[PDB]
Nucleic acid binder design. Structure first.
Ligand SMILES: [Mg+2]
Ligand SMILES: [Zn+2]
Lengths: 1303, 49, 146
DNA sequence: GGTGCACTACCACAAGCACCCAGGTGGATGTGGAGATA
RNA sequence: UACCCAUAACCAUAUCUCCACAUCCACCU
DNA sequence: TATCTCCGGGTGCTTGTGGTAGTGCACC
């Protein structure tokens, strides 16, 4: 009944494995083809894993619900489903120990570091091959001193085991000259032809000779040491004190000559493989090793203490986590429940099986063969061989590939799939249960535009909607009398021939207030999931509101979308309130709206709010003469002056027509008197305006979509064409000053009128619309002439190939821009209403580059090598390209295709890294007592070598908007109180003030200085959301930050972002300074030597030829200043300057590339990920732990607080802030679930299993994994529970409260 | 597949977006009630009926 | 090549069959069994990578599928993972490989189709037709260059 | 008692190795086989 | 103990079959 | 004859190893 709070992972003892399993498996017999029932005690046995049938036992006497629990008469099975076979577990009792492959093959060898054993060769060779380790006795000498844990080959080992033995057959019937106890040296002539090899004793038989490097001792009395015992010097051998042992070795007494022979082999440990390891782990005690490592770490210098602590941390982890390392290797191997590896028939009796079954079968066979072999007899080499096969079988079962590649039966060279294969990998257990790849009430279909719909609605095909809401439909039509019961209703709906109009009435009844989530497959950011109100439609496709065509990256070229149906009322409220598309109009990446008018609406609105002008061939002077009104009216009566003329002060249009109200003007427009693009005098609410009726209509549209008109008039600019930027500003202002509902209604009205006027306006693209200016012709001639000159400049030898190439590239890239400028000059001069020029001027479609390609020329074309061709493309798509030019451009086409197909992959990987490293950060908080801030600059320190200038408006907006003031500032007679959120108006005021020249840096709060333990506080975070208002407490800023970072990456340089997020060493590292001083440049030709000169020292830096520096001699230089030009290694920068400097550098450098692509991204997210990126410190002055270890900055802060003030003992735990790449920070986390789920499950799980890691369920990934409620969002404790009661019951309960005070 | 269409992948990017909002129970139902909790899904179907 | 691999398998089989064979009047039966070569040919024509389902949606689809050139294949030549260096076109594709026919997606640049006038002569050497130009006259003589 | 010599601890470079190479959807076709014994 | 005292036995609760993997070809980013 | 049984390429990382200079023991 209790709730899950922590998940503990630790090693499993052999008795733990015995306790878990129900019985043991002996037969490698899965299932016979004939007997479809489980075969034997094999991997699918019934009574070892539970019944395979549904509810009946083997017999079925005591089974019924009166007496199910009473033990069965002919049976003993408690009533249960097959789910027991899903959970009940087996085990295998290996006759020989084996080691978990993870602890012996992981890069830090846990066995190899706990013991003084070499991982790469020693551990395996003792553990697989025939090598011997031995603790107790090594004092025997082989020309080598004593042994304690030394590894020796089994050849020399087996030698020293039983002395130094040699045997020589002797011919029978020949009495050799050597007697029984004769000492023999090398060269001594044992017979007419026999010679020994070494100093020893030769034993004679009738017919054999035995040369032993042993010592013989005659005696004539009783024996003290019998045959078999191994003796140490000074111990009595025989005859009492007359004969005593002289060396280590074994005693053999032969009474035939009444002699004691003592060999030189003492009883020494002999072990192979896992058992040996077990012995070691059995005799190892952790506390003494811990103390010894402590002394061996504290005294010596850093190099040895590095490995000392590397093993001491493991030892401490074992000691403090409970589980002792004796069961670090496994004796009994668990056996997975059968249903997790079922053998399922495919067709024709053949059974498809999981490879786990094959691995278990092989292991069972090897184990049984070992048991039989050890039972019958012991051929030593054969026993060792079969031990090796058993060991390799266990290792293969645990995982395949780390040692060879055990495979399926030959002919199918597919390596088998093992446990580690199931866990890890791009598609493992983690990367499918983290995902929930399958959902019940879902559908998908092609999408078509739904322009008739409002923004808070979407069209749903009636058939798939009927299918999706099937239980709701059944209940709702059961409310009426259409069907008696649920089965009849389901059968009625089970065929579409039984449909009725009453059914569709009920379906419309069900979904009156419901919402569904529409989803697009590549979900780059938060807006890829949006709720909608379904509207039943007759058709197949999904009708989609066009305005979300950019929220999703969803065009209508055939792409599909999915739909999901939330069930609980609580989830319905969630979706309808905070996911409905009407409530999400602004980006989370910045305040820029995403519900902005799209291409076609922009085109229509630009067409309706444009002013035309043609010509003035008459005396335009009109301000002066009042006769000019009549005279110029006559001129317009003739063809002297056009209606939309360029008069001096006024056009004849404003003179001729004047309108009392906008209604009158539009009514006169309806009579074809005047076009919407003609300026005319109109008397608005209080003023006379010279505007076109189109602009007046636009203003009226805005004023009608909203309620008040004064507000609408004050929030528009009716003096310019409505380009997409103007529309975006209009939408943002309306959202700011009106709210949600009115902004949505304004967007709907804008979309509708834009569609209508785009239709009636009639903009089409004809081949003649792509006008080719004639001026470019002569330009080409000029350029050609120049090229000829440059070419002859080469033929005189004045230039190199590189010089000529660069000159040609410069010439062509200049003339291209000249031509494009000429093209737009032509367009503005001659044909203002050209569809191409109109589309380019508005934000509808196209870019100046594309227009130049259409009408001008696509000059420079890139080579596959990355450079650009010498010969450009003269022709454009208005004309016809030559075959050769088309073949040339195919290079760039293919480059673009491949770059998409690969950079998308890279960017997705980057986004995954980000979202992992940031998933823990959610704003649950009180305002943290941060007396700290960041000073956002307003001036670029260096655009020229020495110059200061104000930063661009975009950068200042993206750095300051939505931030919280660190401290009060007054700049222009305005008191910006401390703690006031900076709106757009405040930022614009600050920019204007800096332009006047009053302040240069703004102190603001930031996540980079937030003191909240996990997450950031509301103040330190800021103000930007989908809304404008300050952030609600409890919403995941980390995930949205990561998504905002990653979303533009697909549409992008990027490797620079990679090497900045992942702290790396750039190849083009720039030389930097670390100490204050002066610059002494020496121009030595070998290598330019720059000296940072100080009072007591001088640092010398050598600069090669390519080292293009950027400082002048004698300049003062500080720490962290980049002396040369190039990228800066963040690590040495942190070593030199400090944390804040490197954080600022990272933020600015990351923002640089994003700006270079034109992407507008706020800096809150980069700051968040940077803060998570360097939340780690490595302690230098020890406290109660080792020194050269790095972990959480917050934890060390708490520990220092406890040590110094909370507890007695002023031990300063002096650390250094450590910067590591995003990957390492993501991996090394306190929680092991996320780390295991992220990159490498093997190493992470091994580390978390060495020491019991009680994973606390903080961070969203863990709660998703376990499936429990997310801490963020609605799960935040600040709003997790909120008692709700009506006013009348409130009065009842409060009346109970006042009477609770009795009398 | 052959018998029934099957569900739709909800992946992780969709999960990331769903938890990017304040949606908490939505993700819980869509990971357990509608996908995996056998007892949960049977009980939910019976209750909604 | 697949036929000769199967043939070598059959050769090893008949070598063994002779090895334990005693007498000699056993030429047809006790020497050659059709299982290896037949199985090898069947496997090549059924489960190979390059023997793929025909795309008979329309006659043009079938023709293009029949005259499509693939870079990947048996596996030791090129695979799907890493090919970014060779996906791009070459200056020699002019007149031999269509620089536009490649299918968008993962198999971009790897899979292509030869030009219309292309012709493999005897060994995978695409020859482009060219008209001989002698002095200032273009002769009807048409000659195929590698 | 101080420098020539030898030495040993430390850094830059080269080699071996584990691990990357995005998300979802539809469709199609393929699967213990040869020898030996009964 | 036999009147009390001595009693323990027989039937009705359901989401599943296969879909695995490999190879190949396409579609949408 | 039918069934049962043998037949990487690229990056970062880590580690290592020879090198190289500070400093410990012998000629000045
Ligand atoms: Mg599309
Ligand atoms: Zn804070």
């Amino acid at each position: 009944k209790k709730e899950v709070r922590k998940v503990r992972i630790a090693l499993a003892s052999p008795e733990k494995i015995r306790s878990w399993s129900y019985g043991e498996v002996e037969k490698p017999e899965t299932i016979n083809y004939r007997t479809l029932k489980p075969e034997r005690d094999g991997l699918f046995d019934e009574r070892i894993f539970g019944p395979i049938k549904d509810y009946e036992c083997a017999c079925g006497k005591y089974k019924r619900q009166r007496f199910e629990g009473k033990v069965c008469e002919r049976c003993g099975v408690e009533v249960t489903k097959s789910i027991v076979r899903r959970y009940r577990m087996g085990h295998i009792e290996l006759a020989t120990p084996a080691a978990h492959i993870w602890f012996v093959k992981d890069v830090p060898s846990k066995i190899g570091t706990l013991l003084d054993l070499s991982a790469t060769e020693l551990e395996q060779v003792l553990y697989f091959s025939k090598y011997i380790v031995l603790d107790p006795k090594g004092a025997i000498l082989n020309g080598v001193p004593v042994e304690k844990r030394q590894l020796l080959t089994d050849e020399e080992y087996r030698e020293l085991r039983y002395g130094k033995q040699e045997t020589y057959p002797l011919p029978p019937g020949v009495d050799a000259l050597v007697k029984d106890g004769e000492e023999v040296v090398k060269g001594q002539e044992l017979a007419p032809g026999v010679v020994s090899r070494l100093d020893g004793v030769a034993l004679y038989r009738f017919a054999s000779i035995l040369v032993v490097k042993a010592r013989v001792y005659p005696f004539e009395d009783d024996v003290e040491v019998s045959t078999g015992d191994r003796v140490a010097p000074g111990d009595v051998l025989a005859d009492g004190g007359k004969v005593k042992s002289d060396v280590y070795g074994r005693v053999e007494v032969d009474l035939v000559r009444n002699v004691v022979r003592v060999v030189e082999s003492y009883d020494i440990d002999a072990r192979m493989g896992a058992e040996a390891i077990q012995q070691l782990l059995k005799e190892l005690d952790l506390e003494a090793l811990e103390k010894e490592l402590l002394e061996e770490m504290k005294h010596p210098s850093r190099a040895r203490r590095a490995k000392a602590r590397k093993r001491l941390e493991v030892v401490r982890a074992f000691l403090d986590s409970g589980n002792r390392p004796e069961w670090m290797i496994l004796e009994a191997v668990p056996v997975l429940p059968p249903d997790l590896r079922p053998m399922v028939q495919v067709d024709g009796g053949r059974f498809a099986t999981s490879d786990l079954n094959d691995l278990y079968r092989r292991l069972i066979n090897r184990n049984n063969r070992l048991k039989k072999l050890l039972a019958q007899g012991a051929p030593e080499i054969i026993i060792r061989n079969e031990k090796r096969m058993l060991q390799e079988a266990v290792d293969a079962l645990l995982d395949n590939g780390r040692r060879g590649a055990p495979v399926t039966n030959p002919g199918s060279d597919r390596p088998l799939r093992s446990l580690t294969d199931i866990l890890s990998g791009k598609q493992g257990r983690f990367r499918q249960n983290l995902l929930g790849k399958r959902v019940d009430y879902s559908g998908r279909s092609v999408i078509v535009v739904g322009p008739q719909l409002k923004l808070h609605q979407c069209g749903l095909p009636k058939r798939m909607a009927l299918e999706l809401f099937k239980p709701f439909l059944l209940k709702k039509m059961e409310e009426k009398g259409i069907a008696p019961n649920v089965k009849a209703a389901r059968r009625m709906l089970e065929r579409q021939r039984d449909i009725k109009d009453e059914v569709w009435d009920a379906l419309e009844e069900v979904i009156h207030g419901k919402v569904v989530l529409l989803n697009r497959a590549p979900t780059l950011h938060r807006l890829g999931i949006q709720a909608f109100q379904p509207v039943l439609v007759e058709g197949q496709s999904i009708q989609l509101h066009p305005l979300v065509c950019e929220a999703f990256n969803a065009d209508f070229d055939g792409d599909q979308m999915a739909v999901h149906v939330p069930l609980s009322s609580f989830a319905q409220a969630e979706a309808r309130i905070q996911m409905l598309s009407a409530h999400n109009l602004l980006s989370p990446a910045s305040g820029e709206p995403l519900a902005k008018p799209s291409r076609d609406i922009i085109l229509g609105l630009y067409y309706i709010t444009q002013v035309r002008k043609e010509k003035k061939g008459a005396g335009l002077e009109f301000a002066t003469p009042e006769e000019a009104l009549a005279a110029h009216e006559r001129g317009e009566v003739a063809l002297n002056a056009p209606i939309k003329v360029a008069g001096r002060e006024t056009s004849v249009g404003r003179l001729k027509y004047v309108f009392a109200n906008p209604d009158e003007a539009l009514l006169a427009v309806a009579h074809g008197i005047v076009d919407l693009q003609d300026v005319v005098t109109v008397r608005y609410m209080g003023k006379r305006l010279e505007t076109s009726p189109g602009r007046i209509l636009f203003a009226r549209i805005v004023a009608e979509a909203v309620e008040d008109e004064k507000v609408a008039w004050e929030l528009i600019q009716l003096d310019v064409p409505q380009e997409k930027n103007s529309l975006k500003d209009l939408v943002y202002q309306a959202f700011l000053r009106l709210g949600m509902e009115k902004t949505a209604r304004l967007l709907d009205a804008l979309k509708y009128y834009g569609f209508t006027f785009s239709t009636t306006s009639g903009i089409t693209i004809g081949i003649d619309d792509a006008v080719i200016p004639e001026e470019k012709k002569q330009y080409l001639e000029e350029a050609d002439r120049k090229l000829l000159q440059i070419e002859q400049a080469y033929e005189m030898g004045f230039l190199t190939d590189r010089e000529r190439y660069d000159q040609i590239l410069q010439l062509w890239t200049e003339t291209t821009e000249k031509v494009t400028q000429a093209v737009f000059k032509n367009f503005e001069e001659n044909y203002p209403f050209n569809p191409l020029y109109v589309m380019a001027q508005s934000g509808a479609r196209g870019n100046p580059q594309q227009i130049r390609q259409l009408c001008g020329l696509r000059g420079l074309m890139q080579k596959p090598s990355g450079e650009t061709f010498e010969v450009p493309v003269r022709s454009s798509f208005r004309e016809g390209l030559t075959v050769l030019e088309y073949f040339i451009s195919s290079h760039g086409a293919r480059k673009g295709g491949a770059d998409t197909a690969l950079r998308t992959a890279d960017s997705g990987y980057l986004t995954r890294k980000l979202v992992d490293v940031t998933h823990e950060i959610v704003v649950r908080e009180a305002d943290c007592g941060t007396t700290n801030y960041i000073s956002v600059p307003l001036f670029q320190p260096d655009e020229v070598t020495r110059s200061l200038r104000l930063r661009k408006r975009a950068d200042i907006e993206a750095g300051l908007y939505g931030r919280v003031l660190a401290r009060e500032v007054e700049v222009l007679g305005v008191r910006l109180e401390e703690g006031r959120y900076l709106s757009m108006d405040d930022v614009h005021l600050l920019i204007k003030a800096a332009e006047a020249g009053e302040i240069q840096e703004v102190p603001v709060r930031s996540p980079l200085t937030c003191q909240t333990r996990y997450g950031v506080c509301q103040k330190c975070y800021g103000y930007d959301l989908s809304m404008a208002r300050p952030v609600s407490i409890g919403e995941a800023v980390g995930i949205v930050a990561a998504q905002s970072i990653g979303e533009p990456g697909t549409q992008l340089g990027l490797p620079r972002v990679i090497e900045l997020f992942e702290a790396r060493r750039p190849k083009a590292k720039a030389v930097i300074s670390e100490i204050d001083g002066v610059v002494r440049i020496e121009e030595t030709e070998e290598k330019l030597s720059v000296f940072v000169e100080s009072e007591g020292f001088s640092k010398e830096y050598k600069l090669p030829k390519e080292a293009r520096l950027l400082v002048k001699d004698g300049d003062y230089v500080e720490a962290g200043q980049p002396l040369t030009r190039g990228a800066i290694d963040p690590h040495q920068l942190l070593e030199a300057k400090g944390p804040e400097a490197v954080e600022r550098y990272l933020v600015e450098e990351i923002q640089k590339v994003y700006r270079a692509q034109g992407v507008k991204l706020h800096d809150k997210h980069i700051e968040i990920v940077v803060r998570q990126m360097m939340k780690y410190v490595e302690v230098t002055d020890p406290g109660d732990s080792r020194l050269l270890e790095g972990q959480v900055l917050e934890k060390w802060d708490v520990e220092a607080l406890n040590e110094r003030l909370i507890a007695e003992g002023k031990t300063p735990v002096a650390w250094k802030p450590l910067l590591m790449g995003v990957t390492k920070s993501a991996l090394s986390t306190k929680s092991w679930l996320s780390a295991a789920s992220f990159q490498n499950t093997t190493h992470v799980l091994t580390e978390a299993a060495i020491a019991g890691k009680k994973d606390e369920l903080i961070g969203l990934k863990e709660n998703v994994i376990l499936g429990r409620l997310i801490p963020a969002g609605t799960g935040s404790d600040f709003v997790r529970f909120t008692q709700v009661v009506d006013q009348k019951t409130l009065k009842a309960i409060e009346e109970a409260r006042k009477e609770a005070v009795e009398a | 597949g052959k018998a029934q269409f099957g569900g739709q992948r909800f992946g992780e990017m969709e999960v990331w977006a769903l938890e990017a909002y304040g949606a908490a129970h939505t993700l819980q139902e869509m990971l357990t009630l509608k996908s995996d909790d056998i007892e949960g899904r049977n009980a939910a179907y019976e209750a909604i009926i | 090549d697949q036929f000769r691999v199967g043939l070598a398998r059959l050769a090893r089989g008949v070598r063994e069959r002779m090895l334990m064979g005693s007498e000699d009047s056993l030429t047809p039966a006790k020497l050659v069994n059709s299982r290896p070569l037949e199985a090898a040919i069947r496997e090549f024509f059924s489960r190979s990578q390059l023997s793929q389902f025909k795309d008979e949606t329309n006659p043009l689809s079938s023709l293009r599928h029949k005259r499509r050139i693939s870079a990947l294949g048996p596996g030791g030549l090129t695979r799907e993972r890493a090919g970014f260096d060779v996906r791009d076109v070459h200056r020699t594709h002019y007149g031999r490989i269509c620089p536009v026919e490649t299918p968008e997606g993962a198999n971009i640049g790897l899979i292509t189709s030869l030009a219309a006038y292309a012709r493999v002569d005897e060994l995978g050497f695409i020859r482009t037709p060219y008209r001989r130009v002698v002095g200032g006259v273009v002769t009807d003589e048409v000659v195929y260059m590698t």
